[PDB]
Amino acid sequence: MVQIQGSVVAAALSAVITLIAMQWLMAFDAANLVMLYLLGVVVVALFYGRWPSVVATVINVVSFDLFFIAPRGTLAVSDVQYLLTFAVMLTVGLVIGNLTAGVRYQA
Incomplete structure (x- = not known):
């Protein structure tokens, strides 16, 4: 099975944020x-x-x-x-929005 922006997005973004935090x-x-x-x-x-x-x-x-x-x-x-923070926030908003839509099709 494959959904538009789901567990894969979460896992991918998770690994990324984790790596970023760890590296930073x-x-x-x-x-x-x-x-x-x-x-x-x-x-x-x-x-x-x-x-x-x-x-x-x-x-x-x-x-x-x-x-x-x-x-x-x-x-x-x-x-x-700040610049990075904004980019991160915006990116997060996009990710959370997509992940939300993918997992929660309608409400």
């Missing part, structure tokens, strides 16, 4: 522009395989474009923490 917590950086990207992309692929409803594209694009101003510095000029 470890040492003092968001990631070495590899581990997070590798796992991220893998998860992104997992997310992509949940029916093309724009949201996935947006989520991927946001993360893709944001893939630079993540670490607490990354030679950025604006507030990396």
Whole structure:
């Protein structure tokens, strides 16, 4: 069986957030522009395989474009923490919305 944005989305996003939190917590950086990207992309692929409803594209694009101003510095000029936070919040909103819709078709 396969649903549009379900357990796969939750698992994928979960692994991602967990990895992000773990990596961010470890040492003092968001990631070495590899581990997070590798796992991220893998998860992104997992997310992509949940029916093309724009949201996935947006989520991927946001993360893709944001893939630079993540670490607490990354030679950025604006507030990396805030910028990332916003991107994360927006992404979360999309994920939760999709996951909710997928699991809860109608109400």
